[PDB]
Each structure stands twice: as structure tokens, then as C-alpha cells.
Design a protein around this ligand. Sequence first.
Ligand SMILES: Nc1ncnc2c1c(I)cn2[C@@H]1O[C@H](CO)[C@@H](O)[C@H]1O
Ligand code: NA
Lengths: 329, 7
Amino acid sequence: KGPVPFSHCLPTEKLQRCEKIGEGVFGEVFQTIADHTPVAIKIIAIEGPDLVNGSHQKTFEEILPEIIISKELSLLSGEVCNRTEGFIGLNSVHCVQGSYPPLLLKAWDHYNSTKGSANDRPDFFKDDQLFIVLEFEFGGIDLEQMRTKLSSLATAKSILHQLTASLAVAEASLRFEHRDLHWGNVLLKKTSLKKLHYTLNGKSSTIPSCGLQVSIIDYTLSRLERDGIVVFCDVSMDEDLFTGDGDYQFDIYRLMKKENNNRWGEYHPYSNVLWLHYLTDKMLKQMTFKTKCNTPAMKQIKRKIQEFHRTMLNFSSATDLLCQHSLFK
Amino acid sequence: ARTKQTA
Ligand SMILES: Nc1ncnc2c1c(I)cn2[C@@H]1O[C@H](CO)[C@@H](O)[C@H]1O
Ligand code: NA
């Protein structure tokens, strides 16, 4: 077949509505709308010689694991025995060719002026440059940007409960590890559902939403298996992944390496526990709740979450936490 | 937020 122009993924009206909503070393994420429905578009340069955001571009083979894992996780919303909507929907993947669309560069510029960017302005790509364009369901706003917007300690418990269940279901279905579940990768969207449903090994349960649906995104470093074929990112030789400081996030990579003996092909669901611990730590230390923590009931929820924080590292997986931890009774 | 630290 071969690639398609950016205009294929982003016809005039869709392109005009693109706004930048995030970034990483991988490239750029734009929100737009199609058939009256918001979507997020992740654009990753591939196969070219230019350094991008400090790193070499991936080949098509190197980007396949992300695509495969994005598809498997998206599929869980539709399964029976192990079902959850707690990841993100994947709509489509395309291989696109061109220089960066001028309208996306303007959107890039607007973000850089308001939020600041840690990326290079993507204005040096030639007309034959390839990209992978992944279109996802819009999952709302990341937990870091929502750190002053959560209502109450009940909201915090619901988010942790949703995260834990989603991970457990992915563990059970796919021997999944996220491996990079920093707070940019947890999305919150308003829902009018009072409770959310999941199914773990044929058993269905619900979790009070407190008005929010959580989505886990970005499977760049993730791992799973299907048909006893493991799909993963081998970061054994990536030293700078392990040398960060100034946030507990950067200890999580070191602690994962310790757990797995630097062997990233193996299944170690304890990594999901480590990420949950980091998120629980964020809930306790970096959130300013709109209703603060002002009643005996809210204080009690805070105490239960601190207890979770002090105990949860003695569990072996998200599935073990969900099924056995007192917080979820 | 980002996987590796970077201003
Ligand atoms: N599907 C989505 N819905 C809403 N926002 C999204 C996504 C995706 I894929 C990514 N993002 C935003 O972009 C940042 C970088 O991955 C993330 O930190 C996040 O802010
Ligand atoms: Na979701």
C-alpha cells in the first residue's frame, strides 16, 4: 500500500480543530474532533536520520510493540472473562508521509507559549518524512493537570480503585505491566455513571465513580504476552532511564530493575504494584482537594489511603491488591 | 510529566 498524506488522517476541518494537548520524547499529541466526538492524535516520526527530542527515531519494527499493546488493551472493553474500560480506545493507526502540517506547527507554537515545551519544534522534517499517527479516544485530562481539581478524598480513593482494577484485569488477561505509569499517563474524564463495571476472571464487580472515569495511557515501555509471545520494550541498556532524581517516579524505574534483575522480557506484576504506590504517594502529597479534608469521614478516607500506602508494597500484583487489600472491601 | 527528567 504505502503511506498516505497528513490530509488523509486530518482533512481540512479536523486539522483546523487540532490543538496540542501533550508531548513526550516520542513526539506530539493533538486533540481534535471527528463525527462530533473528541479524539487524541499521537504523532511519532519514524525511519528518518534526524535526532528528535534528543533521541533517534524508531524504525517501523520498533514502534510495533506499542501498536500491538495499544490494540490489546483497547480490546479489553469488549471482552467477557476479563473486561475493563480503564485503558484507552484505539481508533486507527496510519503511516503518514510529509513535512509537518503548518497548522500543527502553529498549534505546537501555541502550547510552547502557554505551557512551555521540552521538545524541538517539529519544523525540520522533509516532504518524504514518515510518521506513525495513532488515533485514540479522548480520555480527558491527566492527573498532574488535575492535581488541584479533585473534589475530595473519595475522588482519590475511586481513582486508586479504578487504576488497581484496570491493572488487575490486564494482568489476568495479558500478563500486562505498564512500566511507566507516571501521573501524565493517568487521565480523568467526567462521567455521569455512578458506578463503573469490570470483570476479573469471570467475576463482575463495580466501583463508585465519584463522577470520574479513569484511563491509563501510553504503552511505550509496556509489556504483555499473547500466545506466549512476549511484546515489550527492552530497556536493559538504557542507563538514563535509571538515573533520574527529584521525584519518586524516578525511583520506580530503579525498583523495577531490582525486581526483574534487569530482565525486561520476564513477567513481574510487582511493577504494577510499584506504580500504584507511586500514584498513591502522589494522591497523598501532591493533590489539593477542592473540599480539603474537613470531616471525620474524609479524614477516615485519608487514613485508609495512608494505610494502603504503608502496606501495599507487601502485595505481589495489582490482582493481589484488588482481591485481598482491605481498602477495596 | 515525562518518563525521563527534562526542563
Ligand atoms: N488519549 C488521550 N486523551 C487525552 N489526553 C491524552 C491522550 C493521549 I494517547 C495523550 N494525552 C495527553 O498527552 C500527554 C502525553 O502523552 C498525556 O500526558 C496527556 O496529557
Ligand atoms: Na478509558
